[PDB]
Design a protein around this ligand. Structure first.
Ligand SMILES: OC[C@H]1O[C@@](CO)(O[C@H]2O[C@H](CO)[C@@H](O)[C@H](O)[C@H]2O)[C@@H](O)[C@@H]1O
Ligand SMILES: OC[C@H]1O[C@@](CO)(O[C@H]2O[C@H](CO)[C@@H](O)[C@H](O)[C@H]2O)[C@@H](O)[C@@H]1O
Ligand SMILES: OC[C@H]1O[C@@](CO)(O[C@H]2O[C@H](CO)[C@@H](O)[C@H](O)[C@H]2O)[C@@H](O)[C@@H]1O
Ligand SMILES: OC[C@H]1O[C@@](CO)(O[C@H]2O[C@H](CO)[C@@H](O)[C@H](O)[C@H]2O)[C@@H](O)[C@@H]1O
Ligand SMILES: C[C@@](O)(CCO)CC(=O)[O-]
Ligand SMILES: C[C@@](O)(CCO)CC(=O)[O-]
Lengths: 374, 374
């Protein structure tokens, strides 16, 4: 795998398509799918959403130079905004000097909420539910033998109590579910329905909402990058001066929600187009990201930018990354399947790690540009 | 204008396209633009983003029944997820019984941040900047005579001081700019550059970031809906019982960020597809919405659901809505221009009000469905 895109600025879209097809070993059918419009015929689109009367195209670009955990990866991006793809590619190029991005993730754990009303002893009922955790987990896992055979399934539960609300006390059971390579919404929603009668029997209450949480803070992707001063040096500015400017811009985002919103928007300029191009749900990724950014009690930066003891710039990101390689549009849309092949994805976790790296690079591109503007 | 879509579930995409073309008075060229793929040829896409090698289609559906401030409006939605378009259409149909949605907006005011470093008396320098507000406003307005002739331009300034940061004191000037029918990013970024030398002269400091804020809390859209119990009644449930279930679900989102993230995600299922279909920047709308949802110090619901004194369900939303009718992809993409024509838009404010109404309806659809699931 080689993610370098020599002279791509000067090539036509057809020439870029042919280069990508050669670099990724795309089949003749896959090349033809890209060479004509309408890779998603209306008959297919008609089965995806309601009241279909057409299709709507986003430009599809490729960000170059990315290397993640030692592996080059080409990154498709479906987006309408200028400068985004070029900035991601340029920051990835600089990241290559330190060996690229380094990433990790948690297990692919999604939360399903089971909201219980009518329980007047919710703290005591919480203990009864926790004592019965094995029975609840077994009930959650009793229908999806395929997921369990892959090593997924419900792994744990939590119980949260809201003893005083305008609607009375609420007891909320969270099922913690390993969803493997799925985004997980339908999987965990079905388990929440499955456990509802047992939860009602234990608590004596009435189950209302049975629904995933998009605050997917048990399904985190992490990415780190390090750039020395010499890597960041330009004709006009020392790398040291650029590093100090990035830190100035980062601290501004850390302390001021008015800046943090724009700073994090820039991250999502990198992440969302990868989500879209792979057929994933961009609203879910946006909600998890921005809700996680508020976890401390103030809306703040999702990234951290620092200087290590030797003076190099170090960037880091950690954020929920609920994405899948199966199900939804990722299965039905022929170009989403092609995007997965271009990226050579082995797991949904890997897709999330790559997306986090792209968001981190995008953020660096914005901070480096804004801090070096004369 | 009539936004009812009779028997749309049973029509083919071609039949739906022809109905919409007839209802909206679309030209023959516009009808043909929808009837074949590739409304955005690669030569056009190639000028929008970098490294273009293709295009990526989202299904394009239409939500029916919406009526906003007494005017029916058909709502294009570019999205990949099932159930979304049908739920928006169904909730809009119920809203028609009370006359539809009622909306308002603030002036289209965007913030540009001018970050000043090196000022050791930032509180005193803030006063010097405020005393010079007229001169700063005149400088901001000196280049864009067209915007000013439309009644736009910089209208006010604020100054915020962060006296103790890891990077030293920061003084941040906000330019408050009426951007008329533009999203406003380039407009306000240019004004921030224009005022930087004058701000440096007044404060003695050094300007670093000159950049819009995506926390666009001076550019708000508001939407309200009211539904009586008889409107919400179904074969299986009284409207009264459904209303109580919606309130139960709403309070859950108000008090628990794990639920609020999913609740607000549902809002963005309605809003974002309209943003995409009109060529607008969906990352900007997402960032403003979710950052605003954290303004109270906890991540919470963007909507409010209540019962009025007579027992009717009342929903309300207020959120930043930075959208445009001009500039960006909204000008270049032929289908984005067609979307504006389908919606018969008179201003960017109106687009924002319609989008807020769609988000409110989408939220109602999710809460009503989740609360009435057996
Ligand atoms: O992993 C090697 C070893 O080197 C350290 C520095 O002591 O990290 C360096 O190597 C990493 C692997 O490429 C880089 O990601 C990092 O930027 C670089 O400093 C240790 O952290 C690590 O144990
Ligand atoms: O696959 C999950 C499991 O594999 C490990 C082994 O190192 O990580 C592999 O897959 C991850 C997802 O891309 C990468 O972060 C990692 O580099 C790769 O070796 C474990 O980290 C993880 O538990
Ligand atoms: O605007 C009319 C007048 O009626 C009130 C109720 O007293 O609101 C009703 O009419 C509105 C306009 O259609 C509806 O939006 C609202 O739902 C309905 O109650 C007053 O608020 C208003 O002044
Ligand atoms: O156009 C802004 C200006 O017009 C008013 C007049 O009522 O509102 C008009 O346009 C708004 C945007 O769609 C609508 O909310 C309103 O219904 C419509 O009459 C003022 O509200 C506003 O200051
Ligand atoms: C450049 C930026 O505004 C994104 C442009 O869409 C992000 C940022 O300011 O960090
Ligand atoms: C139904 C919902 O999960 C959106 C589905 O994408 C939103 C919600 O739970 O309110």
């Amino acid at each position: 795998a080689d993610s370098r895109l020599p002279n791509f600025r000067a090539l036509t879209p057809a020439q870029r398509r042919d280069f990508l097809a050669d670099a990724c070993g795309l089949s003749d059918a896959e090349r033809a799918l890209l060479a004509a419009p309408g890779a998603l015929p209306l008959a297919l689109a008609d089965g995806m959403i309601e009241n279909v009367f057409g299709s709507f195209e986003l430009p599809l670009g490729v960000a170059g130079n990315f290397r993640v955990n030692g592996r080059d990866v080409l990154v498709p991006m479906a987006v309408e905004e200028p400068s985004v793809v070029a900035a991601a590619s340029y920051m990835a190029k600089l990241a290559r000097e330190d060996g690229g991005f380094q990433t990790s993730s948690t297990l692919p754990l999604m939360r399903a909420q089971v909201q219980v009303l009518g329980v007047t002893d919710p703290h005591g009922a919480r203990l009864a539910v926790l004592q019965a955790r094995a029975q609840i987990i077994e009930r959650a896992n009793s229908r999806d033998k395929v997921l369990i055979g892959l090593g997924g399934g419900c792994k744990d539960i939590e119980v949260h109590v809201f003893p005083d609300t305008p609607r009375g006390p609420m007891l909320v059971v969270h099922l913690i579910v390993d969803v493997r390579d799925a985004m997980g919404a339908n999987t965990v929603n079905t388990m929440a329905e499955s456990v509802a009668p047992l939860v009602e029997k234990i608590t004596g209450g009435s189950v209302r909402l049975r629904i995933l949480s998009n605050l997917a803070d048990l399904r985190l992707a992490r990415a780190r990058v390090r750039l020395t001063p010499q890597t960041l040096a330009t004709q006009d500015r020392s790398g040291e001066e650029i590093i100090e400017g990035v830190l100035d811009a980062y601290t501004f985002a850390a302390i001021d929600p008015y800046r943090a919103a724009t700073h994090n928007k820039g991250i999502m300029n990198g992440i969302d187009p990868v989500i879209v191009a792979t057929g994933n749900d961009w609203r879910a990724v946006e909600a998890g990201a921005h809700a996680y950014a508020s976890r401390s009690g103030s809306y703040t930066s999702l990234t951290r930018w620092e200087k290590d003891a030797g003076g190099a710039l170090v960037g880091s990101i950690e954020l929920p990354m609920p994405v899948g390689l199966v199900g939804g549009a990722t299965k039905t849309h022929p170009l989403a399947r092609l995007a997965l092949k271009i990226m050579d994805l082995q797991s949904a976790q890997q897709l999330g790690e790559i997306a986090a790296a792209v968001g981190l690079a995008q953020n660096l591109g914005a901070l480096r540009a804004l801090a070096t503007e004369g």
